[PDB]
Design a protein around this ligand. Structure first.
Ligand code: HEM
Ligand code: HEM
Lengths: 151, 150
């Protein structure tokens, strides 16, 4: 990671605030994601043939939103421990790779997330850029690991 | 959960303090777990020929230790949403079941954890009991789901 101290601090500081509100706004993020990206929704076989109102309230969606938040937290906490960061992200990668999810889906989700998070918290463009750069490190690890793995 | 509000609150409060020390103390917990239960150590194949000093400082242990506290956090966060808790714990169960880990190994880890946490934070027996009951909720879901998975 070539993330600077100020970049990592902006992300960590932003995330510290965001994570408390995620418990309530996270499901709405995933609905937004699913509405933009029906192919993303389609990986959640539990949601087959379900109205988006029902998806939004589903414990399965809420669990994934918690899984998302916790994953992101684990990465942000490890930005100064690159070997640990890579192990954590590779474990995420394997699980999603096994479901036929390409890195491109993470890139979609990350791009939407940064905007969603900025709109919520109204943090500055410095902080938005720092998020984008941080999530590009994460996507870089995901993508490279998916290329290592046998389908 | 027959978990009371007071029980859930005691766990959430003690966790809020412990969580923050887990970077400092989590590796030592797993060393103690490995020394107490050699069979638990043996699930971590990358540690077989390693000195325990090497294990303690390894990125792989540190990653599992982070995974452990995040998983526990996710459960504690969800004590008021039992359908969500069950899903989160079922996901854990699948992954570890596939590695041939029985629920008994989680029972051993959980009991050691509550002792370790109490020794560190010096909370009262009410709080220790609330941890034990909370982790029994979790273990019950794990055990049940392993029966399903077969
Ligand atoms: C940072 C982004 C993400 C994080 C941290 C994350 C985290 C997780 C976690 C921890 C799990 C449970 C463990 C497992 O089976 O893998 C999970 C499950 C899942 N994830 Fe993600 N995920 C992310 C993005 C996505 C995306 C972009 C998709 C789809 C394109 C997706 C689809 C799924 C599915 C379908 C499951 C299985 C859900 C279930 O069985 O209930 N995830 N995710
Ligand atoms: C609350 C208790 C625990 C939690 C939350 C937890 C969580 C995790 C998580 C999230 C992973 C990565 C799963 C993945 O994405 O593939 C993992 C891996 C693993 N866990 Fe656990 N775990 C716990 C207890 C245990 C126990 C008791 C053992 C052994 C008895 C164990 C052995 C392993 C092993 C061997 C791996 C694979 C590690 C590797 O080589 O990369 N876990 N654990």
């Amino acid at each position: 990671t070539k993330l600077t101290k100020a970049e990592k601090d902006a992300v960590a500081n932003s995330w510290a605030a965001l994570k408390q509100d995620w418990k309530t706004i996270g499901a709405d993020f995933f609905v937004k994601l699913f509405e933009t990206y029906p192919n993303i929704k389609a990986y959640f076989k539990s949601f087959d043939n379900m109205d988006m109102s029902e998806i939004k309230q589903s414990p399965k969606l809420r669990a994934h939103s918690i899984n998302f938040c916790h994953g992101l937290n684990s990465f942000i906490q490890s930005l100064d421990e690159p070997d640990v960061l890579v192990i954590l992200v590779q474990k995420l990668t394997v699980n999603h790779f096994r479901r036929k999810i390409a890195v491109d889906r993470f890139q979609e989700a990350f791009a939407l997330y940064v905007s969603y998070a900025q709109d919520h918290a109204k943090f500055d463009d410095f902080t938005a850029a720092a998020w984008t750069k941080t999530l590009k490190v994460v996507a870089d690890v995901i993508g490279g690991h998916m290329q290592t793995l046998q389908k």
